[model samples]
Target: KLKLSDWFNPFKRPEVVTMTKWKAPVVWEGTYNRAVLDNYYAKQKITVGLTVFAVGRYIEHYLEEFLTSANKHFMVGHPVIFYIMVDDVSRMPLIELGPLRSFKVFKIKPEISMMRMKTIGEHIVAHIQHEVDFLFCMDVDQVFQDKFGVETLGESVAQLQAWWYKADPNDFTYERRKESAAYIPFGEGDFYYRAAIFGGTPTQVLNITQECFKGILKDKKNDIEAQWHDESHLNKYFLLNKPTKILSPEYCWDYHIGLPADIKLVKM
Candidate 1:
């Protein structure tokens, strides 16, 4: 904490300390102010890099829905660049983007499985390194029914897993075996985080992605595999790194579950 005198002179003793409302409490999705946040960061022209990789034609039917709703709700009225990664740029769709928003297509090798690279770890970090202000790792198998805007931004953010958030903390399915890299003992863990929707500042996301990739590589050196692959490493990293915000499952809920009274958004 910087001294008040050194940073700002208006206060004598660090000013009246108050908790920030931005940290939405567990399961309380309605408290975040979408309008206030949208207008606040408007002048910055925040350019978000939304990443979705679909190669060789096998993709969910919801791809168009995802793209369309994203254009409508995800950071609407702000600058955004959707990076569509695929083996052939010709496979990219022609979704109409509003002004200050557009799409950028990236081609990757067919054999270079995203399952191996952990989405944002390898090429994505390099590709979006300088172009965008921040990035999001998404599962394109869903559609957005509500807002996903600047209110979601943080130095670091992790989406709480829909299946595991209400589970026993100890049984959180973290990489338990000590031999492999991602490990957490029986009586230790926080909420399980899903890789389907997560991201933050460019530096934090890239750094954590690289770290998880490196952790798996080190495990390979010792001839072992993470229990649930990238997911295990993701849980381990967020547990230690501690995300600036814990996004509720509303950020990635299943439509079949039916909208709960509390959930303000459905990513599926």
Candidate 2:
């Protein structure tokens, strides 16, 4: 029911990269008509799900503002389920959610790179898959600065790393060691995607996590670790199974790096 080409207008920003070679839309600020997507999704009566993993000091310092801003900007006017996973339930941020938004809190262990993937896959298979039409996994350290709405929804979504989007394929920080399952040889790879944010339909997300976890387990068995750990494995998965939608750095800009001219908005 979604036609990506119609929703994104590439010519709006000629200087900016708007689409990938494989035809996935590289979503930019001015390139989309969010109103159109808002209308379309409103009719579908869909529920968007967001999963955040926070533990220890993050719970006290960051989670509150993250939830507060998310309520103001994330998928506004639609139903949303915030799947909050923390190491201690007692330390969870207590905040008031706006109408049409709710949260589910779970006590999960402090997670490592591979454990994070394994836990996400397990939760998706158990209940997240059944609760929402689309799901997003995000790091709790970031805050939403503007509307991060339905234009981001897809069968599978990948966030272009703010620092590496324009870098050459060979220069990407991929797992070079062939012994690791996350390896991608030189001259291969499309984009350096950020694991800080990613989403898709529950089915597709399950596949992503399953594949990434598989690669992680293999590296463990071989007694090898990828350079960027989970992020490296994530890039490997996207290399083989290209995402249906690719979000520009505007979706997750790092202000500390200084904003680029091509990026018109900062969503997070």
Candidate 3:
């Protein structure tokens, strides 16, 4: 019931790095055919879930634009459940969402980059596992710039850090200290993934967050914190468990970085 035609048209960009050493697709704009993916998932009747944290000033500062833009561009022509976690349910903006799109608001407290992992793990086990075929966890600070459709779906997905995608592995900011559970020995590392965006099947995402949170608690017990908190642990997880698909920097590109010729589009 699924067909993916022209999903990896590597000829579209000869200069781009289209595949990983482990043979996973590095998704770029032209590499995929949106029509094909939409048709395949439409027949499968799948729902995509997106989870975002909007606590403190982020509720007022970034949530509205983030939601509105996502309503326009994210997983268009598909069913999407926006799992909004906020400090106060009263503060959620009453924005209009498009057809096939809906949201569920949950109240959470004690915000931290690491605490988010614990909450996400608990929430998935509680309800999200039953609701969607695939799930994504995103940071609230980004705005969707274009159609972020089913071409992104995979068993496990990781977003490449836009600023450091080209940096050497030795220079990747993985926790260098051996005391922390998030640490990577100096000579070993892979692509430095960004914590801002990640996703997978509900069970797969549960694994990601749960493992990272365990590492967080282990570091806490040892009286040390990884330099990048959740991000550091996330990198460590992906290193041991390779993602099935990797997104190019284009998927999370920074507008402030000035457009590079290789990045044909910015999805976030």
Off by over 4 Å in 3: 1-6, 163-167, 256-268
lDDT of 3 by residue, 1-268 (tens): 4433356676676676677788888887688887877877798899999998888888887888778988988898989999999999888796899999999999997447798999998989999999999999988878777778888999999988854334567888999999998999877877889888899999999999999999999999899999999889999999999999888777776664443211222233
TM-score for all models, in order of appearance: 0.80, 0.92, 0.92
Candidate rank order under lDDT:
3, 2, 1
Question: For residues 1-268, could you state the per-residue lDDT of candidate 2 as single tens digits?
Answer: 7676557889987876778788888887788888889888899899999998888887887787788888988999899999998999988867999999999998886757567888888889899988899999888878787788888888899988854345677888899999998899998888899887889999999999999888898888888988887889989988999998888887776664433211222233
Please report, as a residue range, the 10-residue window in candidate 3 with the lowest summed lDDT. Answer: 259-268
Cα lDDT of model 2 overall?
A: 0.83
Q: After superposition, how far is residue 260 of candidate 1 from its true place, in Å?
A: 7.9
* Candidate 2 vs. true structure, TM-score: 0.92
Number of clashing pairs, model 1?
Answer: 0
Q: What is the C-alpha RMSD of each candidate to the true structure, in Å?
A: 6.8, 3.3, 3.4
Poorly placed runs, candidate 2 (over 4 Å): 163-166, 256-268
Q: Could you give me the TM-score of model 1 versus the true structure?
A: 0.80
Model 1 misplaced stretches (Cα beyond 4 Å): 1-27, 60-62, 112-127, 163-167, 257-268
